[PDB]
Structure formats: C-alpha cells, structure tokens
Curated annotation (Swiss-Prot):
Residues 4-159 form the RNase NYN domain. The lineage of its organism: Eukaryota, Metazoa, Chordata, Craniata, Vertebrata. The gene is Zc3h12c. It comes from Mus musculus (Mouse). This is Probable ribonuclease ZC3H12C. The chain holds residues 243 to 408 of 884 of the full protein. May function as RNase and regulate the levels of target RNA species. Induction: By bacterial lipopolysaccharides (LPS) in macrophage cell line RAW 264.7. Belongs to the ZC3H12 family. It comes from the Eukaryota.
Amino acid sequence: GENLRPVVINGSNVAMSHGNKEVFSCRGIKLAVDWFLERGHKDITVFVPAWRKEQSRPDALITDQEILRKLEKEKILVFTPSRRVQGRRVVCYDDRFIVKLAFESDGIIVSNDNYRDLANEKPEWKKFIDERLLMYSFVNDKFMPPDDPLGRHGPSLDNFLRKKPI
Ligand code: NA
C-alpha cells in the first residue's frame, strides 16, 4: 500500500452503471471498492450526496441502500452535504469534492464522467483529470477497469495505480 495511489470514487456514477442502468445500485459501489481492497489499496474514498439516504422514490430508485451507511461507518464512503431550504433540495456538487480530494492527494479518480465543467474552470484540474481518470465497465457483478486507461501507449493499469512504476 505504500507505493499505491489514493483512490477516489464517484459513487453515484458507479451505482448508476451497475445493475439496471436507471437504478442507483449500491452493490456496484461495494464491488468497485472490493476490487481495490483486494489489490492492497488502503486509501479509498467514495463520495455520494447525502440525499441518497432519502427513501426510494419512482424518479430516484435505489437498491441495497443500507450499503451506503455501512460503508460510511467503515470510513470508506463520505456523504457530501445536502439539505432542504424552503421545501427545496439544496445540493452541494459532489464532483468538486471528488476532483479536489484526488488532486490534493495526488490520487486517481474512478468515474466514467470526465467533469468538463471543472476541467474548464482550472487548467491544472483539466490536466490532472485527463491524466488520472480511471473509466470502467461492469459485466453483471464483474468490475472491469481497462488495462490501458490512457490508451495504447500509456501506462499499464498496474503502473497507473502505483506512485512509482515497478
Ligand atoms: Na444502476
């Protein structure tokens, strides 16, 4: 774990991708986290907005919701702030937590969204996101990051996840 990069996961992106594409499937977050834990990663942060603790509704379907609170108790998942004002949901943008933490910790970002609004705000964030984004596919419960996260000539996935190539 000493030579490994910190891992920051877009929890909502991963939960939408897993299972039914239109359902927030929390087992998907668990499966991604487990993929990194089994490789020895000890520094993993999953960000999810706090309002995903609300009860399942027809326009916000969720499965295995209890996973979120459990991962929070394990200090793997962190809720980003959300509240109500005058009956309206006021949500802090979780993408900024994800990018800022990965950037300040010299880590990698697990997400199929490449955050072009934040990239266009700060040139250093654009360069960081473009170099440190880990996209992925699920096949059922199989979490499959690409072995070539930066294409043909980039690092192997093994070396992408390390601080110093081995
Ligand atoms: Na889903």
